[PDB]
Amino acid sequence: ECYSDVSVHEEMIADRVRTDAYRLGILRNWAALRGKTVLDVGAGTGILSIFCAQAGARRVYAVEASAIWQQAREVVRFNGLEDRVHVLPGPVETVELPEQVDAIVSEWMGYGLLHESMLSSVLHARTKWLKEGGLLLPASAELFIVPISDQMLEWRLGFWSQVKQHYGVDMSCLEGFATRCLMGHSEIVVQGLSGEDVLARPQRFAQLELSRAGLEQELEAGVGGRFRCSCYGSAPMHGFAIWFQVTFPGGEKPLVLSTSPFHPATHWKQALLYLNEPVQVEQDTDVSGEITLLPSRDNPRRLRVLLRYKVGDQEEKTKDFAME
Amino acid sequence: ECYSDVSVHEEMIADRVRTDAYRLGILRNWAALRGKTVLDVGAGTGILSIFCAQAGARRVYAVEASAIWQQAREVVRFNGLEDRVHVLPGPVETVELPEQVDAIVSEWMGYGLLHESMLSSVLHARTKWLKEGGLLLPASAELFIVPISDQMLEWRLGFWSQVKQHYGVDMSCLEGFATRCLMGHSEIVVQGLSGEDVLARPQRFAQLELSRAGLEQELEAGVGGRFRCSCYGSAPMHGFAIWFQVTFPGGEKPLVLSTSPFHPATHWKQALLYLNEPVQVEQDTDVSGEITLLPSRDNPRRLRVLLRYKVGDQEEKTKDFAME
Numbered sequence: 001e002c003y004s005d006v007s008v009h010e011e012m013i014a015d016r017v018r019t020d021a022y023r024l025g026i027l028r029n030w031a032a033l034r035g036k037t038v039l040d041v042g043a044g045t046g047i048l049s050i051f052c053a054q055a056g057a058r059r060v061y062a063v064e065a066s067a068i069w070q071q072a073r074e075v076v077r078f079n080g081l082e083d084r085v086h087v088l089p090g091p092v093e094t095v096e097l098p099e100q101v102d103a104i105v106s107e108w109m110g111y112g113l114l115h116e117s118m119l120s121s122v123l124h125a126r127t128k129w130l131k132e133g134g135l136l137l138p139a140s141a142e143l144f145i146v147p148i149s150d151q152m153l154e155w156r157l158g159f160w161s162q163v164k165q166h167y168g169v170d171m172s173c174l175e176g177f178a179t180r181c182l183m184g185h186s187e188i189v190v191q192g193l194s195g196e197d198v199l200a201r202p203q204r205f206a207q208l209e210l211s212r213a214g215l216e217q218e219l220e221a222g223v224g225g226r227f228r229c230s231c232y233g234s235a236p237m238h239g240f241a242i243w244f245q246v247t248f249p250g251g252e253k254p255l256v257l258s259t260s261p262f263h264p265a266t267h268w269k270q271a272l273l274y275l276n277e278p279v280q281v282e283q284d285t286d287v288s289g290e291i292t293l294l295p296s297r298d299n300p301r302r303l304r305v306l307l308r309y310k311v312g313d314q315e316e317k318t319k320d321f322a323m324e
Numbered sequence: 325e326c327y328s329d330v331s332v333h334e335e336m337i338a339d340r341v342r343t344d345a346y347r348l349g350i351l352r353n354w355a356a357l358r359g360k361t362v363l364d365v366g367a368g369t370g371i372l373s374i375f376c377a378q379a380g381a382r383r384v385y386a387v388e389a390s391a392i393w394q395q396a397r398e399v400v401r402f403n404g405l406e407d408r409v410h411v412l413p414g415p416v417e418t419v420e421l422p423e424q425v426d427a428i429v430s431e432w433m434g435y436g437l438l439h440e441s442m443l444s445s446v447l448h449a450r451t452k453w454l455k456e457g458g459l460l461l462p463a464s465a466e467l468f469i470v471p472i473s474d475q476m477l478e479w480r481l482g483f484w485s486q487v488k489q490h491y492g493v494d495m496s497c498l499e500g501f502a503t504r505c506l507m508g509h510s511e512i513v514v515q516g517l518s519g520e521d522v523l524a525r526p527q528r529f530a531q532l533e534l535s536r537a538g539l540e541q542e543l544e545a546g547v548g549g550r551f552r553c554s555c556y557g558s559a560p561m562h563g564f565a566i567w568f569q570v571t572f573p574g575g576e577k578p579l580v581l582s583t584s585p586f587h588p589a590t591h592w593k594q595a596l597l598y599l600n601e602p603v604q605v606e607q608d609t610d611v612s613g614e615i616t617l618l619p620s621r622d623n624p625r626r627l628r629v630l631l632r633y634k635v636g637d638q639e640e641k642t643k644d645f646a647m648e
C-alpha cells in the first residue's frame with residue numbers, strides 16, 4: 001500500500017506557502033547556483049531539485065531514502081532533466097557522490113521545528129559533502145513563543161454546558177472533566193491558530209545558524225532560553241504556542257518562510273503547550289519563562305519540551321511536554 | 325490521559341442527527357415506556373438513559389463498560405435522576421440486573437454498520453434480559469449500496485497534473501501512481517459524500533430485524549446479497565458507497581435514522597469501496613453485483629467485505645476489502 005506515500009507528498013506540494021518559499025528562496029540565489037553543484041537532502045518527489053536546475057545548477061544530486069525516489073526518478077526523466085538531476089536512493093548518510101558540492105538544499109523541518117526532523121541528516125551532509133564556504137538553503141532557523149487563547153479549545157471546553165439547550169439534559173457538570181482531559185495531559189498539540197489567538201508580542205527564544213560548529217551537540221543537550229512578554233488585554237490564556245521560521249539568503253534581502261499564526265497557514269501549523277487549566281490575563285499581565293526543546297529520553301527523534309513559566313502574580317510552574 | 329474518552333463522546337453528542345433521532349425515537353414510544361423498565365446497552369455519558377426517563381420510564385439500567393460511566397453517574401446525579409437511572413459499570417454480558425426489562429435502547433452501530441459494532445452485545449442482552457414481547461430501540465437496520473463518483477478523490481487523482489501551472493514542474497506523470505495508491509488498495513474508506521456523487525438509485529441489500537432468532541449466526545456467516553441498478557448519466561465511477569439506516573417503531577409511522585449521502589450528514593459518513601481505477605459510465609449503464617459483510621479472519625470484530633461486481637459490458641470482477 002502506497003497511499004501514505006502519496007498523501008504525505010501531496011500535502012507538502014499542496015502547501016503553497018512552503019513550496020513557493022523554497023522556489024523563490026532557491027531562484028533568488030541563481031547567481032550563486034548557476035553552473036554549480038547541489039545536494040538535495042531528502043529529495044522526495046524531486047521538486048526542490050528541479051527548482052535548483054531552474055536556478056541554473058549544472059548538477060543536482062537528489063538523495064531520497066523512501067520509496068518515493070522511484071517517483072522523483074520518473075518526474076526527472078519526464079521533464080527531460082536526467083543529465084542534470086541525478087536521483088539517488090537511500091540515506092544521505094551513506095550515499096556516495098562523485099564530488100563535494102557547492103550548495104545543499106533541504107526541507108527538513110518538523111512539527112515544532114525539531115520533532116522527527118531531518119536536521120541531523122542535513123548537518124551530516126554539510127560536514128561530509130559541502131565545500132568550505134558553500135551555500136545552505138535555508139541557512140538558519142528561529143524559534144518563537146507566545147501566550148495564546150485557543151478559540152477551538154474554548155469551544156470544546158464550553159460544549160458540555162450547551163447540551164441542555166439542545167437535549168434537555170444538563171451536562172455542565174462535565175466541564176471539569178473536559179478541562180482535565182483536553183488540557184491536563186502533557187502532550188504537545190499541533191494545531192493552527194490565527195492572529196487574534198495571540199495574547200502578547202511573540203518572543204524569539206532560539207536561533208539556529210546551520211553553519212555553527214557544535215550545533216549537533218547543542219541540539220542533543222537542548223536548545224531554548226528565557227522569554228518575557230506583556231499581554232494585550234483580557235483573555236482566557238490556555239497556554240503557549242511555539243513556531244519557527246527559516247531564512248534563505250538573497251544574492252538582496254533574505255527570504256523568510258514563517259509558520260507564525262499571523263502569516264499564511266502552512267501544514268506545520270503551530271505546536272501548542274496547554275496549561276493544566278485556563279488562566280485569566282489582563283492588559284499588561286507579565287508572562288515569562290524558560291523553555292528547552294530536546295530529544296525525548298526513550299526515542300531521540302521525538303521532541304520533548306521542558307517549560308517553566310510564570311503568569312502574572314501566580315507562582316512559577318513547571319510543565320513538561322512530549323509530542324505523542 | 326482521557327482526551328479520547330472526551331472526544332469520542334463529544335463527537336456523538338455533537339452529532340445532532342444521531343442524537344435527535346434517538347431522542348425522538350424514544351420519546352415517541354412514551355406510551356410503551358411510561359412506568360416501565362429499560363436497559364441502555366452502552367450508556368456512555370447517560371444521554372439515552374435520560375431520554376428514556378423523559379419518556380416516562382420508571383427505572384433505567386445504564387450499563388457502560390468504559391471509564392465514561394463515571395461521567396454518566398455524575399450526569400445522572402447532577403440532573404437528580406439517581407432514583408430512576410442506575411448507572412452500572414462493566415460489560416453488559418456480565419452485569420446483574422434485579423429484573424428482566426420491558427425495553428432495550430442502544431446506539432450500537434459502527435462504520436459500515438458492522439465494523440466494531442456493539443450489535444452482538446445488544447443481542448446478548450436481548451436474549452438474557454428483555455421480556456418476551458419487549459421493545460427494542462431501534463428495532464431493525466437496513467443496508468444500502470450504490471455506485472458513486474467521489475469528487476474529493478477525483479480532485480486528488482488530478483492534483484499531480486496541476487503542479488506545472490503553479491511551479492513549472494510537470495508531475496502529470498504521477499497520475500498512475502496516485503491512482504494505484506488511492507484506489508488500488510483493499511481498504512474500506514470512511515468518507516462523507518453528497519447526493520450529486522450518487523450515480524444510480526440506491527439498492528437495499530440486507531435487512532436486519534433485531535428480534536430475528538438466528539441473527540447472531542447470520543452475522544458470523546455473512547450478511548448481504550445481490551444488487552442491480554442503472555446509472556443516471558455520464559460520470560467517472562470510482563466504486564460503491566455503502567450505508568445504513570435504523571428504524572424506531574412509533575406508538576404512528578416509524579422514525580428512521582439514515583446515514584445516506586442524500587440525508588443530513590452524520591459522524592458515520594458512508595463506507596466507500598473503491599475500484600482499482602475509475603470506469604466511465606453513461607445513462608442506463610447497468611451496475612450489478614453481490615456483496616457480503618462478514619467478520620475478518622484475524623479479528624472477528626473488524627469488518628470485511630466481499631464484493632463481486634459488473635459494470636456495463638465489462639467482465640465481472642472480484643474485489644474484497646477490509647476496514648483498516
Ligand SMILES: N=C(N)NC[C@@H](CC[C@H](N)C(=O)O)C[C@H]1O[C@@H](n2cnc3c(N)ncnc32)[C@H](O)[C@@H]1O
Nearest residue numbers: 012042043044063064065066091092107108109121
Ligand atoms: N520535513 C519533512 N517532514 N519532510 C520533507 C521531505 C521533503 C521532500 C521534498 N524535498 C519536498 O520538499 O517536497 C523530507 C524527505 O526526506 C526523506 N528522508 C528522511 N531521511 C532521509 C535521509 N536520512 N536520507 C535521505 N532522505 C531522507 C523523506 O523520505 C522525505 O521524502
Ligand SMILES: N=C(N)NC[C@@H](CC[C@H](N)C(=O)O)C[C@H]1O[C@@H](n2cnc3c(N)ncnc32)[C@H](O)[C@@H]1O
Nearest residue numbers: 336366367368387388389390415416431432433445
Ligand atoms: N456506536 C458506537 N460506536 N458508540 C456508541 C456508544 C453509545 C454511548 C451513548 N449511549 C450515546 O448514545 O451517546 C457505545 C458505548 O458502549 C460502550 N460499550 C461497548 N461495549 C460494551 C459492552 N459490552 N457493555 C457495556 N458497554 C459497552 C462503549 O464504551 C460506549 O460508551
